[PDB]
């Protein structure tokens, strides 16, 4: 927050920004160790510097601002004279914008730079201006009459022919157009053009729209995001200008209570309650048909219904086939009443201050009620990745909400039968009103007036939706994507792989993406697209030599779901299966990555039902190849059914997929068997959960 922003230009005329870095105090020195890690001292020559910011005095008085270099030119408030010495009458707590400019060929490299020193004198007392009185500019305040990177300077005349030249920062977001178009990085408020060696050191390559101050369409500018100057409750992956700050509030059920009495405050009547699990993505994956074969490199799957993490499915547990109505004795035409234990969540990147969600409780298409939770009853604010009630505490009962304090949610006799038939209660959050956080004064977050409504729509119109589903947590993102048909759309082009990396802060290991310890490469996950996204990806895959979905360009409107497997092995470092695959030979480098299972005969895994969830649809996937023979691989899965299929591998790796289903907890082991013939290679065997099934 404190200090001034230094703009260091390679040229003499403040045009070619080499380094943007904050200085501490009037000494105008930056953090040299951090700049060193980003600058090559043989390529660090600068010929003009500008420092900008705000002076806030701690005492009214007549301040004389000066610099040890007569060369330097200063201005205060864009209103004072432009001079090496300024006499300003300042008031306590008032803000005085300051612009210090130095032009000097033979200024030297950034390392050897003897920067000027900024002093001020009050009552004849001359001192270096302390850090506590120097503040950076409000870079969220885009002032057309005071641009962050002006196209003119205090030293050079505004030439007539110099008209019609390009702006340095066309959208006035404080990132030069050359930076945005070609790539930059910001770490510790230090900004520089991108170099590919920065990736090895862990710096993130930022690109953004040089014509859009808010490329993602969210409340924060490209610089606010890239620099991390926004609300610290925003997830760090939203620092990327192409990853929107975007709250995604939903609610899931973990207990369903059905009573014959409508009154929440009544201990009379018959009541049946059952624990429930919930899924933020089941409505998405339940509409996925699984093919055994994949063609033309398209190793992903299509869902008929791309639902977001706001549409939550409910699975009733420990039912034992006992109908809901046996414990209620409700008759045809009568109604029982629903109470539930619910938990709100935020799978997005931004907090929802004053969270006011609207959720439809849906059963087989029927809206049983519309829950209108008030912020005062759900923790006021819901931060990304958090829940209300908080993760460790008991879930919120609907009856304690003001809406249901007097009466519960009625449910019909016929709707009770649908519940027995296996129809799942959906909690579909349709809209969430709320506010975002902007800083104020000493760095405090201010929320009121900052409605999310218009930004939510704006973000959605220029973005792709990417959902990452792990067992523990689901993450939904909005990544800005270009309209490839719009010739004037200056949104940076991302591959799907680059977008996934940015959206989730994924790391890389041997070029493949990792989400913490989970591999999320396309060969280690179940990618799920809607029909329109899948058709675009299939067409793009036909234009690539290296046919990888992650190399396909991201287009706006795309809907992408990454379902990480429950169990996975790459036959290398990773094998979290709960049983041992038999007859495994990994003494080779013939895998899709690293080693493969060189299958000489039969490989078998026996998985107890203690290691799988009951009444779920699973897909067993993997990659196979056979370089010198076309030997059929026999695949046999023994679950709720016993099915056998004959698989033909090619010389290169191809994907196979087989769906299977679990039943009760007391079921026999799930057995998966693959039989090869000597030169069969297997890799990246996964078991992924898809959806619940009726009981």
């Amino acid at each position, epitope marked *: 927050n404190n200090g001034l922003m230094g703009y260091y230009f390679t040229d003499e005329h403040f045009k070619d920004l080499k380094l943007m870095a904050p200085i501490k105090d009037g000494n105008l020195k930056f953090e040299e160790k951090k700049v060193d890690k980003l600058l090559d001292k043989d390529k660090s020559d600068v010929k003009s510097i500008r420092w900008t910011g705000r002076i806030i005095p701690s005492k009214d008085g007549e301040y004389t601002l000066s610099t040890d270099r007569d060369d330097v030119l200063m201005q205060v408030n864009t209103e004072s004279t432009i001079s090496n010495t300024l006499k300003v009458n300042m008031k306590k707590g008032k803000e005085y914008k300051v612009r210090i400019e130095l032009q000097d060929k033979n200024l030297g490299s950034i390392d050897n730079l003897s920067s000027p020193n900024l002093y001020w004198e009050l009552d004849g007392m001359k001192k270096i201006i302390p850090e506590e009185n120097l503040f950076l500019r409000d870079y969220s305040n885009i002032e057309k009459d005071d641009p962050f990177i002006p196209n003119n300077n205090f030293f050079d005349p505004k030439l007539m022919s110099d008209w019609e030249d390009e702006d340095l920062d066309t959208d006035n977001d404080n990132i030069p157009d050359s930076y945005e178009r070609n790539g930059y990085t910001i770490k510790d408020l230090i900004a520089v053009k991108w170099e590919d060696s920065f990736a090895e050191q862990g710096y993130k390559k930022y690109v953004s729209n040089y014509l859009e101050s808010n490329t993602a369409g969210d409340p924060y500018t490209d610089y606010e995001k890239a620099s991390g100057s926004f609300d610290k409750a925003i997830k760090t992956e939203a620092r990327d200008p192409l990853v929107a700050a975007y709250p995604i509030v939903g609610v899931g059920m973990e207990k369903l209570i059905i009573s014959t009495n409508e009154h929440a405050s009544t201990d009379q009547g018959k009541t049946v309650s059952r624990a429930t699990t919930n899924s933020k993505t089941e409505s998405n994956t339940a509409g996925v048909s699984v093919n055994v074969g994949y063609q033309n490199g398209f190793t992903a799957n299509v869902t008929t219904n791309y639902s977001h993490t706001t549409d939550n499915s409910t699975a009733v547990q420990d039912s034992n086939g006992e109908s809901w109505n046996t414990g209620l004795s409700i008759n045809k035409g009568e109604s029982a009443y629903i109470n539930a234990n619910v938990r709100y969540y935020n799978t997005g990147t931004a907090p929802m201050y004053k969270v006011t969600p609207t959720t439809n409780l849906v059963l087989d298409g029927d809206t049983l009620s519309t829950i209108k939770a008030q912020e005062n009853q759900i923790g006021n604010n819901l931060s990304p990745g958090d829940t209300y009630p908080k*993760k*460790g505490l008991s879930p919120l009962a609907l009856n304690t909400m003001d809406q249901f304090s007097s009466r519960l949610i009625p449910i019909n006799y016929d709707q009770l039968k649908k519940l027995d038939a296996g129809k799942q209660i959906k909690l579909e959050t349709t809209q969430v009103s709320g506010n975002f956080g902007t800083k104020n004064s000493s760095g405090q977050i201010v929320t009121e007036g900052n409605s999310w409504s218009d930004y939510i729509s704006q973000i959605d119109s220029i973005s792709a939706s990417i959902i990452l589903d*792990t*067992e*523990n947590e689901s993450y939904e993102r909005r990544v800005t994507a270009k309209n490839l048909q719009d010739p004037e759309d200056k949104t940076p082009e991302l591959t799907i792989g680059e977008a996934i990396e940015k959206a989730f802060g994924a790391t890389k290991k041997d070029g493949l993406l990792y989400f*913490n*310890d*989970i591999p999320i490469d396309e060969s280690c996950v179940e990618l799920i697209f809607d029909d329109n996204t899948a058709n675009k990806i299939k067409d793009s895959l036909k234009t690539l030599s290296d046919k990888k979905i992650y190399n396909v360009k991201l287009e706006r409107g795309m809907n992408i779901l990454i379902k990480t497997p*429950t169990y996975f092995t790459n036959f290398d*470092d*990773y*094998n*979290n*299966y*709960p*049983s*041992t695959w*038999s*007859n*495994v030979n990994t003494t080779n480098q013939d895998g899709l990555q690293g080693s493969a299972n060189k299958l000489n005969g039969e490989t078998k895994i026996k998985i*107890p039902m*203690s*290691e*799988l*969830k009951p009444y779920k649809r699973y897909v067993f996937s993997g990659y196979s190849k056979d370089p010198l023979t076309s030997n059929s691989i026999i695949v046999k899965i023994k679950a709720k059914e016993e099915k056998t299929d004959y698989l033909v591998p090619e010389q290169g790796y191809t994907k196979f997929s087989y769906e299977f289903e679990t039943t009760e*907890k007391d079921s026999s082991n799930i057995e998966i068997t693959l039989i090869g013939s000597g030169t069969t290679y297997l890799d990246n065997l996964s078991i992924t959960e898809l959806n619940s099934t009726p009981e």
Partner: antibody
Amino acid sequence: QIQLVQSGPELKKPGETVKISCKASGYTFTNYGMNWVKQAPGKDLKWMGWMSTYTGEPTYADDFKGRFAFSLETSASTAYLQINNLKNEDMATYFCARRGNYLSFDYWGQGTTLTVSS
Amino acid sequence: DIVMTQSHKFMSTSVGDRVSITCKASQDVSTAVGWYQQKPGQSPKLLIYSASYRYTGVPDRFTGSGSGTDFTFTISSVQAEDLAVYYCQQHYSPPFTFGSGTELEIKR
């Protein structure tokens, strides 16, 4: 990096109940199970069973069916081992150990000694 | 239950000597054998996994060999910090039996 941190040493009377906790960090808790291992003063390392952090279902070794209960707090990345109706034979050091890659016990807790005495 | 029978309860050695511990599995465990080191009062530490794969950060004086039922753990040059108990363990199928352990001791 990956750390398994167990609760401190326990002193219990015979017939009492004790609950050992095992907090995991540095890895996705629900992607790997949790083994529990007993080491009696003079005996070898004995596998007590494991807890699936994916299903929440425990599996118990034959010698530990009855008085032993594994439980889960996924929101705290914590596994628990409860022993009811304590006997002197329960005096041992108890370890949690990740059901790691290829079912190897690749990360171990520091151990929890349990002293049973009247 | 797959039983892991280890070579010697006690093994006397000198610092800088070579020692090998064998372990016989009661049935085929392919390569699913681990070797653990335990110093007094500490938890076991995985040294070798999958019979031969050195674990992260493990010195290269520790090596593992074998497949099927016969397995060897070797310290090419014993260091004073290696005086501890070493267990073989099958991590093939429960109950993941541990060997009875081999204590390294200084010969005199």
